[PDB]
Amino acid sequence: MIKLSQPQIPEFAIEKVADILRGGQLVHGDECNLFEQELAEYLGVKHALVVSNGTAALHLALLALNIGPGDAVIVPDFTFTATANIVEMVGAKAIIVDVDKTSYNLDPQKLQACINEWQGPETLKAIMPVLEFGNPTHLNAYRDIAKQHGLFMIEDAACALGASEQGTMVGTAAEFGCFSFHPRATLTTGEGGAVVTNDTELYNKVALLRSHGMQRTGVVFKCVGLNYRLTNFQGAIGRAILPELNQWIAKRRELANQYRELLAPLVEVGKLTLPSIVEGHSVQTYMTVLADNFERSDVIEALRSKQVESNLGAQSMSSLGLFNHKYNTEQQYPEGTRLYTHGLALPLHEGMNAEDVATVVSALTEVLEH
Amino acid sequence: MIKLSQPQIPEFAIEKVADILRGGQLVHGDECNLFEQELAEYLGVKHALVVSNGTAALHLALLALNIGPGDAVIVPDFTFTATANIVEMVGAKAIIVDVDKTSYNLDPQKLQACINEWQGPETLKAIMPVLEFGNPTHLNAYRDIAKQHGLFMIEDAACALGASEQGTMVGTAAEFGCFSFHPRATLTTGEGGAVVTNDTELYNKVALLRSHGMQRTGVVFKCVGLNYRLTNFQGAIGRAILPELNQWIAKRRELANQYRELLAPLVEVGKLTLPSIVEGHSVQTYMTVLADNFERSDVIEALRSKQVESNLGAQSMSSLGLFNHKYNTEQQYPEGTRLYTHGLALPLHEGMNAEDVATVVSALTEVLEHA
């Protein structure tokens, strides 16, 4: 099977994990602390904190910003369900705004309209744009819009570590950036994530919330908190991969260019559309959109039988019945709905070569012919 | 240093972790599924779910029971701060009740009185007894009290996997049992935990909440949820240790009796009191209480200089200034406060032998002579 991902953890990292298990510290230790330092340096951001997973990162960002009951946060229609779920979990309401069809990211015009029209009853406190599939498109616009309207911005950069727009590293534009180290995420720790910020007060708050409100001095419990700590052995894995991330992103960009060339016939005859792999895109996922006449579920099944793993890219929040703020049924979300219904992620990861891309395109061509 | 714990992960499990990293599934997979089945069998409970940590287990239990804003949960005064924190995190109020001097567990008579006096304004929905340091004392009474008063019971069994009272395994008495696999917890996965229950509807709810509301026609998102999944390689570690747990607990109980014997001279002259290591205690921590005349922080430091790791056992919730419900401001908590201020955990783990216990007792005797 040509898979959506197939992370290769360096053997020296496996050996380090074994050493840690055999005779090292298991909870967050030197490996996690060094990983944080190295992540911060990589991003050019003041602070990083590693955490249990990318959902945990978003959760902690919301909590550190005192977003909760009585509040609202804008999310894109097209994203993984965690983005909207985690807003609701802290007691806030997820306010859905459509994405644009080119980038698959929160549409800045529709975002402006939502903010402009907002009059409560909840207090609109934040935007949570997703840099979907590694696409940084609109990063700086989101920052500008948040600043214009006095909103916090939490980047859901789950799939976008290493991406950048116009000199701004994704995750670093405003209050918080949140990353995932799920096995689809290029840098993986099995489960894992990170919260980054340039604001030391926010860093200190997240550090408390991550581990029971504990401040080292002996230990003082400063506030109520959670446990979202990453193990030291997970940290070891991640920091072993980080020095390779740029090379892996470069490889993914080359593979994407191969897809762009090989898929042009299918585009020209109208059977699908391509993602727009802009400068700074980290190519975490390569999602096409099939023409309406194809049943996407049947295409996935047929590709599986031809040893190609494919899937939808992400969900349409408005389609799920979970985010029932009044705003969310005042208009339709045609772009996110199209991407949810017709989107098709094709394998693209650093373990593939150009021949593997040709294999996938051959299989897809065959399936869409018959 | 003789340490509070020193987990020995079997080499075969390290090899399995390596195999998983090299060529296996990293997210919750067959190892986690088998671990759940084996945990449930070990406990004689219908269902188990492994999760990121013991705090996550408590969190999910609260959420699955719809405990949140407007509600209240009773917690013991003496516990790790997570117990009371996680109640507050879901929007409920932690209502503190003192512990027993002897067992260090929630005092059933003081529990009864708190429930009797409760008249709001919040809705009192649950008790969250802690089986502290692996002590099962009062497990069945907590169940009986919860049933008598129409309350849910969530066992904070973070430190008590393998403990039992009167034939009931800790974690299995009522709605939920919550365990930790932190490195002090005998069975460790570095970080990890488990939620257990006999109620299939509660099981299904927690499984949804643990992974984004996902139900596997294809995936449906049934409800809003979190990510508290344990990795497949953490699951592999935990299920490798579980078959050893009873033997490790038996070893710990042997060591506890060595402490009891050797510490007797200090007890006799009033320098400290001992824990009561009852039948069914899993001996996750061995916590003494120093006499008031000792500065515990100084004892800890002196012991460290003599290659003995020691610490307080747990915190006093009423002492922290975090749990400010009216009830907690009016009630007094002398027992939990004493255990917080004067408790001293001494190393006790399955990697120690009798010689090591003697070493610790020698060092403590020396320190308390020169204090």
Ligand SMILES: CC(=O)N[C@@H]1[C@@H](NC(C)=O)[C@@H](OP(=O)(O)OP(=O)(O)OC[C@H]2O[C@@H](n3ccc(=O)[nH]c3=O)[C@H](O)[C@@H]2O)OC[C@@H]1OCc1c(COP(=O)(O)O)cnc(C)c1O
């Ligand atoms: C774009 C993408 O990668 N989405 C993933 C999402 N998948 C779908 C179909 O929705 C969903 O993945 P999942 O459905 O669980 O798995 P999958 O998409 O079917 O991937 C399976 C494939 O991935 C590979 N894989 C697998 C395991 C593993 O251990 N070895 C491995 O190789 C292998 O090829 C598998 O067949 O969640 C992860 C990813 O999303 C998480 C996420 C989050 C939350 O972050 P975390 O809490 O850290 O997860 C926030 N915010 C955004 C915008 C997010 O995208």
Ligand SMILES: CC(=O)N[C@@H]1[C@@H](NC(C)=O)[C@@H](OP(=O)(O)OP(=O)(O)OC[C@H]2O[C@@H](n3ccc(=O)[nH]c3=O)[C@H](O)[C@@H]2O)OC[C@@H]1OCc1c(COP(=O)(O)O)cnc(C)c1O
């Ligand atoms: C009794 C006990 O073991 N308490 C731990 C608690 N410690 C203190 C002093 O409060 C506290 O530990 P900590 O203060 O961080 O560390 P420590 O007590 O000083 O232990 C350090 C020693 O432990 C050993 N250790 C360490 C790492 C590690 O990787 N290798 C290792 O060997 C080693 O000897 C270290 O020096 O948290 C864990 C434990 O409590 C968690 C817990 C929870 C929450 O569960 P989780 O979310 O899974 O944690 C709920 N509910 C209850 C009733 C709980 O007790």
